[PDB]
Structure formats: C-alpha cells, structure tokens
C-alpha cells in the first residue's frame, strides 16, 4: 500500500502495536559473540543491546578492538551510517578513536546527558573553548571551536587532533536537544528541520566517512533518524515514490543492528516524519 493512506488505515483501526510486533517477529537474528565476551562487560551500556559480529565497527587496536557500534550500509539509497550507544566513562576515548579512524565529518546526538534524573551518556565533548579534553588511552585531543545554540538544537564546531601524527580535522556536532523525556514529539517539523541541517553540512555525503549517530542505546531515536533519511532519499531517486515501503526499509536496516525503532509510537512517528517530509521536498 501507499504510505499516507496505510497510515490513516492503521490509525482508524488502532493496530500500531500489531504492526510493530510483526516487525519484531520477522527481524534478523545474527550472532553477537564478541560483545558478550567477559572482557567487554564495561564497554556495553545495556546487556540486551549488542552489535552483530558481521557489521560491528572494529577499532584499529590489537589489544581489544571492541566498541558497541554498527555499520548500516544502504545499497540502493547509497548512504551509510554508524549507529552507536552513548559513550560510557570508560569508552569516551574509544568513541573519538572511531570517529578518527572511520573519517567521519559529523556526529549526531539525539539525547540529553541527563534525562529522567539519570545519566544517559558521558559528557564527552568540551563545554568551554579554553578547557580542552585529552584522551590519554587513545592519544587524541579535542577542542571546542564554536557553538551555535538554537531553540530545538545546537551545532558545535570541534577540532580533533591525533597527537601521534599532529594531524587535525574539523568535526561537526549536531545536537537535537528537545526530544521529550517520555514518548515522541507531537509534530515532526523540528526533527525534519534538524535532519535537513545535517544534510546541508555535507556530513552525510560520500566524500566523507559515515556519520556517527547516537542516543542512549543507539537503536530508538537513532533508528528513527536513519530510517527517515533513507526513505526520503529513495522517494527522490525512484520513478514511483509511492513504491517506498517503510516497513521493508526498516527490516533491511535491522539486518545490520538489532532493535531499531523501540516502540510502536516511534514507528508511527517515523511514518509521520516521512509523510510530511515528502511534501516539503517538492513544493507544497
Ligand atoms: C521526496 N519526494 C520526492 C517525490 C515524493 C513524492 O512524490 N512522494 C509521494 C507521496 C507524498 C507523501 C507520501 O508520498 N517525495
């Protein structure tokens, strides 16, 4: 079926939970043996969210190459993304090592450091220009260059220096700051505006390594971001945009990381975002 009318048909019939459970039943199951080794217990935030062995990002280190991160490679859309958990106190150096080694331009952050009164990820970037951060375990230095605070999101320019080689690179930090503590946003308008700002920066384009995207577990909000982006790109590329099937795209992405889209409310919000976004791309 088309999307917008499949949408109203699920709303009127109140069957979002049944649609979402079907997705969960059909989703791929692949091994994640490296994630479950005892030496990696303090590298995982949640015991039930792990990267598959076949698609995990490897650190360029011979001691321990493990990070909770996955490469999502979308062949028809010609986009790639790295989806990862929010960094932990003992993985902030690994996080920036990955950004460096994979040649990423942008980092997309969809959570606040504290939500619901608990810590959802480490404070992994510097908050003042004159107070830089050094990660001694991976030999990297990180400096805040500029910060632009808007009503729904903040963009930061950061400098990452590889202290072994003295090479430097500019990294863009796109921080969506207004996702509610419970539920999903009422309108997708600010989330779509944010996606378009990431796109306009070059961070999603083939001349750079894959964008790094995270929330707390790296599957819920993060899944919504890449699902909406890929669906809108396919609607631009194909002769028949109504052929894009958001449930099929989601199952394809779940071949590369488990659990993408965590609730039936997140699934409905993804439909809403793609539907509204497709009207803005053209004219109306
Ligand atoms: C981004 N884009 C390019 C073409 C289309 C498109 O025509 N989509 C058809 C409908 C409108 C809402 C749901 O899909 N969208």
Swiss-Prot record:
Active-site residue list: 215
List of residues that carry Phosphoserine: 50, 242-243
Location of N-acetylmethionine modifications: 1
Molecular function as annotated in GO: cadherin binding; enzyme binding; ephrin receptor binding; insulin receptor binding; non-membrane spanning protein tyrosine phosphatase activity; protein kinase binding; protein phosphatase 2A binding; protein tyrosine phosphatase activity
Alphabetical keyword list: Acetylation, Endoplasmic reticulum, Hydrolase, Membrane, Oxidation, Phosphoprotein, Protein phosphatase, S-nitrosylation
Membrane topology: Peripheral membrane protein
Catalytic activity field: O-phospho-L-tyrosyl-[protein] + H2O = L-tyrosyl-[protein] + phosphate
Transmembrane segments: none
Annotated residues for binding of substrate: 181, 215-221, 262
Highest taxon of source: Eukaryota
A single cellular component GO annotation: cytoplasm
Modified residues (Cysteine sulfenic acid (-SOH)): 215
Residue(s) of cross-link: N,N-(cysteine-1,S-diyl)serine (Cys-Ser): 215-216
PTM annotation (Phosphotyrosine): residues: 20, 66
PTM remark: Oxidized on Cys-215; the Cys-SOH formed in response to redox signaling reacts with the alpha-amido of the following residue to form a sulfenamide cross-link, triggering a conformational change that inhibits substrate binding and activity. The active site can be restored by reduction. Ser-50 is the major site of phosphorylation as compared to Ser-242 and Ser-243. Activated by phosphorylation at Ser-50.
Name by which UniProt lists this protein: Tyrosine-protein phosphatase non-receptor type 1
Shown residues within the full chain: 1 to 284 of 435
